[PDB]
């Protein structure tokens, strides 16, 4: 049974008063470094630093020239040479912006088809490989050092409709995407073809032909009945949610099947458990985990934060005391754990930020 306990130590409402869509702590930091998180919403990126006694300090504030920009997602990386962190941001205008957090300067930018961007993820082992999920039938892999589009996932046997979400596994050997067509698709990026595509993107110099991957390495529509808006890897297992107020834990093939022996033709799936909750059946409601994947968090549309202990097998027993506050009534779009799992931040539609410090 879950043992985790949290206390609300602070909260703030951002001056712009617009919904905050994204929040991400920077995990590319050493023990002893300050705990920094980024929040995105409207045409703004704001960096905050968590301090003692619940203090939340404003470090940086970025305003995009394009007043019509509505940032939805952000993801952290670091510069291969200097090792200084970098923040990628994207939203409504279909543009990926790479911001240097020291100067708050947009150094690089990438444009795909031009459709709004749903989600951003950096490759766990290659900091220059950025995965973009946009309001389109395909997902893109970018090389931000050489500024090239490595690969396009979709088409003939891609998602029949808009891809909503995607995630890399712990070692960046594979991607699991999901979308409007109810399907979840496996794209292996440790294949000879994908390794070579990556290599050539690095070897390219002015001071480029992208791979068109029309077919996945596994596909299923037997997990959810409605659109899948959030997908995450939990080891060799998958966590995914729909509008049916549950996160489903499942795996490809049968109970004992090794994820790396799974054939593209595999017709079977195994459901392992469901993380039940309530009032979170609206569009763009994201779930997150800490570094060690010991905790699962999900905010709902009325300002309640559900937490689960991922070390507990039975999802019913894994349910931790729900985090509530009398002045927190706005939909929680996203939540972020600090690198050490001591601070949990939640961001809402009313521009509020909520800080929960782990008691136990």
């Amino acid at each position: 049974k879950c043992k985790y306990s949290f206390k609300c130590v602070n909260s703030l409402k951002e001056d712009h008063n617009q919904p905050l869509f994204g929040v991400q702590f920077n995990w590319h930091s050493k023990e002893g470094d300050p705990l920094v998180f980024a929040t995105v919403g409207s045409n703004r990126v704001t960096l905050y630093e968590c301090h003692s006694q619940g203090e939340i300090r404003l470090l940086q504030s970025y305003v995009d020239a394009d007043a019509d920009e509505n940032f939805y997602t952000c993801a952290w990386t670091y510069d291969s040479n200097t090792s200084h962190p970098l923040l990628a941001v994207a939203g409504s205008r279909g543009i990926i912006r790479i911001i240097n957090p020291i100067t708050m300067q947009c150094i690089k930018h990438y444009v795909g088809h031009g459709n709004a961007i749903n989600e951003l993820k950096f490759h766990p082992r290659d900091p220059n490989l950025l995965l973009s999920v946009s309001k389109d039938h395909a997902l893109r892999l970018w090389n931000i050092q050489t500024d090239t589009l490595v690969a396009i996932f979709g088409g003939v046997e891609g998602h029949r409709d808009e891809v909503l979400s995607a995630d890399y596994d712990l070692l960046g050997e594979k991607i699991m995407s999901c979308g409007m067509d109810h399907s979840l698709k496996l794209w292996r990026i440790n294949s000879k073809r994908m390794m070579n595509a990556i290599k050539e993107s690095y070897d390219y110099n002015p001071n480029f032909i992208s791979q068109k991957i029309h077919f996945p390495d596994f596909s299923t529509r037997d997990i959810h009945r409605n659109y899948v808006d959030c997908v995450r890897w939990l080891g060799d297992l998958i966590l995914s949610k729909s509008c049916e107020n549950a996160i489903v834990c499942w795996k490809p093939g049968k109970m004992e099947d090794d994820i790396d022996k799974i054939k593209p033709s595999e017709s079977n799936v195994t459901i392992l458990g469901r993380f039940d909750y309530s009032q979170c059946d609206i569009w763009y409601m994201r779930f997150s985990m800490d570094f060690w994947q010991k905790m699962l968090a999900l905010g709902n549309q009325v300002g309640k934060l559900y937490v689960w202990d991922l070390e507990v097998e039975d999802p019913h027993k894994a349910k931790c005391t729900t985090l509530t506050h009398h002045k927190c009534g706005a939909a929680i779009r996203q939540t972020s754990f600090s690198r050490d799992s001591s601070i949990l931040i939640a961001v809402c539609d009313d521009a509020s930020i909520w800080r929960w410090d782990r008691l136990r």
């Binding site: 995990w27 590319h28 930091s29 050493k30 670091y78 090792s83 766990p124 082992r125 712990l170 070692l171 939990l234 080891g235 060799d236 297992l237 795996k251 109970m255 004992e256 090794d258 392992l272 570094f291 060690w292 994947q293 070390e311 097998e313």
Partner: protein
Amino acid sequence: MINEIKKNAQERMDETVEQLKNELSKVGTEERRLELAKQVVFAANRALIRVRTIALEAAWRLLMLGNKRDISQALEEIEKLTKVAAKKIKEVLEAKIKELRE
């Protein structure tokens, strides 16, 4: 350290495997056996998770120490330890899951 990062990881991953091997020793109808098989799958996944996250944390620590010849040799060695520990976890799973049936 560069030497301590590879060492602290080697032991941490090996203490992971030892904890799974014992966690598993603590583990019938067709249904009851499928519940035990799930339990062993759950346990080995938690092990695969730990090993991979140790590698990630070992990798990043080294990457945040900038040799360039020994720092790339460090990651090379750590990523090799990870594949060894994952193999051993997937073999201890395949031994216990066949033991419950037999």
